């Protein structure tokens, strides 16, 4: 939104860059931060940990009833079956979308998100607009922002992760996918479908 008091994005970026490089120089001199540590962390979340991991869990649940039961019983233990877990995903509780219920996740108090299965969250999820409105007008937000219309008769359960428990949505399997392979099914699972702001891809 417009703010007549705010500097340009260019000036803001230039100032932040200087402040960060300065703090970085100090932490480095203290011996607690190094360039390799910086590169390793960035490498992990730019190429290793992402929503493709969550997609693997979803497709297994879609094609394995028993795994699905385990996933819904204890998300953390179930995901470990696929070697998935870790930082900010130590405690996961998966919630299943049905014809009667739709789930949507948010972290109103900050920006908590299940990194192990979804990677780092997109900026809109961490920002004030989505966080403030989703617990108050979830139905209208889904329609207006994501073009996702959820029938008035269908209950919308909004999960506000105020603790370390991370909530992940198991979207319904799209129709017309009978017998599809896990790899083929995965093409329909999106980061958005696991946050609940969108259903899995149709067709």
């Amino acid at each position: 939104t417009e703010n007549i008091l705010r500097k340009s994005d260019e000036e803001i970026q230039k100032e932040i860059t200087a402040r960060v490089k300065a703090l970085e120089s100090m932490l480095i001199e203290q011996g607690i931060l190094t360039t390799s540590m910086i590169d390793r962390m960035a490498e992990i979340y730019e190429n290793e940990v992402g929503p493709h991991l969550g997609a693997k869990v979803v497709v297994k649940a879609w094609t394995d009833p028993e795994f699905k039961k385990r996933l819904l019983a204890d998300g953390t233990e179930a995901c470990k079956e696929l070697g998935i877990g870790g930082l900010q995903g130590e405690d996961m509780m998966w919630v299943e979308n049905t014809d009667e219920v739709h789930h949507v996740v948010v972290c109103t108090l900050c920006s908590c998100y299940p990194w192990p299965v979804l990677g780092l969250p997109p900026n809109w999820f961490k920002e004030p607009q989505y966080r403030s409105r989703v617990v108050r007008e979830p139905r209208q937000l889904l329609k207006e922002e994501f073009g996702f219309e959820v029938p008035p008769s269908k209950e919308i359960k909004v999960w506000d992760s105020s603790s370390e428990m991370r909530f992940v949505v198991l979207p319904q399997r799209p129709a017309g996918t009978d017998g599809w392979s896990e790899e083929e099914l995965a093409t329909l699972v999106t980061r958005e479908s696991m946050i609940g702001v969108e259903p899995a891809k149709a067709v």
């Binding site: 705010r6 803001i12 970026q13 230039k14 100032e15 932040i16 860059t17 200087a18 402040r19 960060v20 490089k21 300065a22 703090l23 970085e24 120089s25 100090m26 932490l27 480095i28 001199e29 203290q30 607690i32 931060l33 190094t34 540590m37 910086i38 390793r40 962390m41 960035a42 730019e46 940990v49 877990g85 870790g86 930082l87 130590e90 509780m93 108090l109 192990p116 990677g119 780092l120 997109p122 900026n123 809109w124 920002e127 004030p128 607009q129 989505y130 403030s132 108050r136 979830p138 922002e145 269908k154 209950e155 359960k157 909004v158 999960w159 506000d160 992760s161 105020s162 603790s163 909530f167």
Partner: protein
Amino acid sequence: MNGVYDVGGTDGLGPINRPADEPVFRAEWEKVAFAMFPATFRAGFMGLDEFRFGIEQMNPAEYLESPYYWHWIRTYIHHGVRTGKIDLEELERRTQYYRENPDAPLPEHEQKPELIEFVNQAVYGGLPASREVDRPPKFKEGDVVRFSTASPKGHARRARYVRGKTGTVVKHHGAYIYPDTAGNGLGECPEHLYTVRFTAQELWGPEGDPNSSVYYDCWEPYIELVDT
């Protein structure tokens, strides 16, 4: 604290800004800011709860419109000063130095295998907040409870929109680090954790969606029994 950051239910924040796609890191400084998390954590600057409290104490106007990772930088500086691990005056001098010389080199330093080990361990091993306590859970699934109306001035996970509201316990997750003590440097003091369901009508009154409910996690001290 009753900070502006506690945005759940706030009106007037505007439409969501969502590009079709975006990079994980929009600029190099974001990568640095991100990596500083495990670095300062390992160095004892703060724990996760304190980390959040530092961000909650930001200038609200700055918090609402500044790039996300800038919040992280603010909390690092906050705790760096708090613990005396960061000299503000020196930080200011260096900031000006890098403003005038953006391409100046960083300090010479040796790489440390222990730091990479820490990163890999924390990422794939995680930092579990679950703990065992000697007391049994006070509540159980089905219990009708009321969220406390306390308003701590320090860190807590008591969203203003749920305070004083009545809901139903959906699940007991066991005990976990308690924010009200941890985020204020008072220790883990683990408490049983429960997910509680609040109808939209209960939270927002008539303006609430007739067919919606919000699930919110409550540590034991946050709730009191209404009906078993």
